[PDB]
Amino acid sequence: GPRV
Amino acid sequence: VIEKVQHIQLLQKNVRAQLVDMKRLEVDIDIKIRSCRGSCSRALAREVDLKDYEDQQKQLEQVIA
């Protein structure tokens, strides 16, 4: 996925 | 020194020759057989028994005296  | 003691003399050294020769052939075959484990489908599971050869070898010598 992505990240914060 | 009689005709037949001469005949018994030669056998005593013919069988000592053969007892060393067999003992050898025995070892030889065990190694040669094991060395087929690396090329043949299987190698016969076996064990040498020198005791049998070494027993008779002492027994022979006793009776050569």
């Binding site: 996925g1 990240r3 | 005949h7 056998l11 040669k32 060395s35």
Partner: protein
């Protein structure tokens, strides 16, 4: 009792008749040992054999008449040493050079930079082992002076179905530029363009920070990702990381497909995922990345 003196002569020549008998047998047996010897010189037959034909790549090889899938030495124009590969060759004369494989999780894909550069895993003639060919090789195979190349990705779920996704003008740069992934365009396929990025739904920027085109290669010990943390460390792989990934074919092998957030230590999804085909919590059963000159892909 003690045998007779006249018995002694019959008895004496009987022993000679068996000593010589023995002797003769001993000579015949030695001779038979000698014959057993010539039977025990060859080694065990190794079933895995490397094919004779060689070329610049699997497509070159296949054009030289090669008919069947197996292990081949290839040597791209700009390479020093030749190297072994798996070539998949179909009925139409297509020779795919396979550079990545997953299927049983037998191989641990958490490898360092050198390891992804040189390669790890094993090649098998039946094409049934997990491997990473090595970046350096991949770079060489895909950058031979003016030969447009194509990558196919092949997925398989834990339910039978499989899906492909193609990419024209595929290319991996030198170590200089951290084995950069570039392609002209998505060439079609019912797995979906996961290198374009994926709208994950955790942020408006996702679609960009998960695209892979242009990404440099990253391992835990060589961080080259667009994220101030460590994609390859956390997600425990070597991949073309952004911030971090929409597709993750070098991910951790999850048996069954379904895995959860609690399955992982660092909270993030580290499995073999391809976001356009399945959820970021479904890890593929089979994974294969292979390349072929573009002019060959119809």
């Amino acid at each position: 009792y003690e045998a007779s003196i006249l018995t002694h002569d019959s008895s004496i020549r009987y022993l000679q008749e068996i000593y010589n008998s023995n002797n003769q047998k001993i000579v015949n047996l030695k001779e038979k040992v000698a014959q057993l010897e010539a039977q025990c010189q060859e080694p065990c037959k190794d079933t895995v054999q490397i094919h004779d034909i060689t070329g610049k790549d699997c497509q070159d090889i296949a054009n030289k008449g090669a008919k069947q899938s197996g292990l081949y030495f290839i040597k791209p124009l700009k390479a020093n040493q030749q190297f072994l590969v798996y070539c998949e060759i179909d009925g139409s004369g297509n020779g795919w050079t396979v550079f990545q494989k997953r299927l049983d999780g037998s191989v641990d894909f958490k490898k360092n930079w050198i390891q992804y550069k040189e390669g790890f895993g094993h090649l098998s003639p039946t094409g049934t082992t997990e491997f990473w060919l090595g970046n350096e090789k991949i770079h060489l195979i895909s950058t031979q002076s003016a030969i447009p190349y194509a990558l196919r990705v092949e997925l398989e779920d834990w339910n039978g179905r499989t899906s492909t996704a193609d990419y024209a003008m595929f290319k991996v740069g030198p170590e200089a530029d951290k084995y950069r992934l570039t392609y002209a365009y998505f060439a079609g396929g019912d797995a979906g363009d996961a290198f374009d990025g994926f709208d994950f739904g955790d942020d408006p920027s996702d679609k960009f920070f998960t695209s892979h085109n242009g990404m440099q290669f990253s391992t835990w010990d060589n961080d080259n990702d667009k994220f101030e943390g460590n994609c390859a460390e956390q997600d425990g792989s070597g991949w073309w990381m952004n911030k971090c990934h929409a597709g993750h074919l070098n991910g951790v092998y999850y048996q069954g497909g379904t895995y959860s957030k609690a399955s992982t230590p660092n909270g993030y999804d580290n499995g073999i995922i391809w976001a356009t085909w399945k959820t970021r919590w479904y890890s593929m059963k089979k994974t294969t990345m292979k390349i072929i000159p573009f002019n060959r892909l119809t």
